[model samples]
Target: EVRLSVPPLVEVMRGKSVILDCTPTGTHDHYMLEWFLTDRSGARPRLASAEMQGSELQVTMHDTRGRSPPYQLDSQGRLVLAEAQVGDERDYVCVVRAGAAGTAEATARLNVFAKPEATEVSPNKGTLSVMEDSAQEIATCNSRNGNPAPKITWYRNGQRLEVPVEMNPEGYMTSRTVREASGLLSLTSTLYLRLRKDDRDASFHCAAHYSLPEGRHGRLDSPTFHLTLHY
Candidate 1:
């Protein structure tokens, strides 16, 4: 009989170190430990394996340099991953194979987050104008390059926009996101303006929110923008 145990989740920020523990216990004579990774897109592949032969361990899986670049396994058979990168997030399965005592397996999930790199409001002419009684796009807020994406928010006159993006008050707002081929995320929030009367001194801004390890939070802001309104 073989019983394998694995942690439920292994979470870390990009470039941070993390471990995927696999404990095999029971009356099984283990000879091999295999690790498989199921990446974000659900592709499961055996990434590494260690076989016990002649009372010695031989690990199969390494970089062209003949050394493990992303992973390593010790005598305990736990995986050590340093500097976690994108596409490293998702499910991991550990399998313990015994010659005749049978096989046991355990699975864990990994979550890797990438902090946003840049935030900006496009068309930053310092001051953009719109004629009253016309609906036009004021500006677009962009928060670029993050894993697991980022939340974008709009501020009108220095206050958070609420309800279906309300109190963009006489304006409308919307948000969207895109994922690059490299597994990074980029987000945008656009502000559309429509005023029935002329108004000056109206200002706007945007912020991007993300999560880090240790229950911490992150915020990135764009420079304040102003909209000129006239009849």
Candidate 2:
């Protein structure tokens, strides 16, 4: 009987490395191991190969791009990736073809995580004097460069604020997400605010929340914004 062993899933952060172990268990005279990756585009590329030679193993890389194969095979038929990028997230298959022992294959799924970039609070008005009798557009909060579309929430004086109720509510919120060719997600969330008399001497800000594996979570907060009122 021929069989291959591999993890069911793996999650790694961007700019990091990952290893996919392909340990084989069987009895055969000659054994050959190959690694293949199927990316989001549905293109399958042979990434590396390994073969048992006596007491040692011979390893070779196949996806060389003149720079170095992003993926390589180690002595134990394990696939090692150095500096993983969004493109590296894919379904990887380890195939062991042994003479007379039939063929064995196993697959592992890869998921990549990237943190959100800068968070900004718009109209950094140094000092604002809003007419007590009228309403004015106070500020806008923006958070960008996140994977899986980060969730944006607004706050006032450290208290979570409810989203504006609207055909377009008072402090409406919206998000725009774009998936790059490399499979990374870029997202921006914006919050629009309207100034009111009670807002005087109040601090406002926005927070971006990202969901990650292992029940872990990430958050980024925008700078505090302030306003003054004039009668």
Candidate 3:
């Protein structure tokens, strides 16, 4: 006979950053684990802890400011969340302690969101085409719509690259870990610049850095692509 189940419900927005996952099936072969949290009278306090054996527990939440206290798992196995306000959101508890066996609990919940806005930075071709002649003058630059994705900067006559003259990771494949988070947000970066065919035609710059919210900062520049030398 075994009993314990409750952990899976999340929503964050105040600052953004959360990853809480706890797993425990059941198997008696030398065991011990704990995690807890409860507030709103249920009375619970203990924020952030970890101890491993079999199951699984990974809780990480940052940026809330207020209301945060009621996160647990203690007896010998530890996991807590002392206090964080935003109404504390609710639902959060995971406890599992075993010596001879028998004792498991789980419950997780928190939904807080409010600040995050970065409209757009569309891009498909502001101007980028590499391959006119020179086979080793490499030149590859691409751009496309951005939400929180737009940070590729490299310049030569305008000087703005501290180090990164040649890089690659386009379309996909090349020590790949392919994934679009399942869908929607798709991205590929490849800015490997190594052009010096006697400065064939010189002049190369591709910039796109959009990170807007409060401190705001968005930019897009790409119109110079001339390095042709067929000799």
Best by lDDT: 1
Worst 10 residues of 3 by lDDT: 170-179
**TM-score result, candidate 1:** 0.81
**Which portions of model 1 show Cα errors greater than 4 Å?**
27-30, 39-44, 52-56, 62-68, 124-127, 163-169, 195-199, 214-216, 228-231
Task: Give the per-residue lDDT digits (tens) of candidate 2, residues 160-226.
Answer: 8786534353566656677766566666555555666677778888887886766589888988877
Better of 1 and 2 by lDDT: 1
List model 1 lDDT by residue over 1-231, tens digit each. Answer: 778889988779988878899877663443788888764677667778888654577888732222225578876667888778876776879989976767888889888989988788884344445543554677888888897778888777777865365554456777788988878888888876664333356677888999886678899988987665433
Model 2 CA deviation exceeding 4 Å by range: 39-43, 64-69, 124-138, 164-166, 228-231
Please give the CA lDDT of all the candidate structures: 0.75, 0.72, 0.45
Candidate achieving higher TM-score, 1 or 3: 1
Q: How much is the lDDT of residue 83 in candidate 1?
A: 79
lDDT score of model 3? 0.45
Q: Residues 26-56, candidate 3: write the lDDT tens digits.
A: 6354443444457667766654445445445
Better of 1 and 3 by lDDT: 1
Estimate the TM-score of every prediction: 0.81, 0.83, 0.24
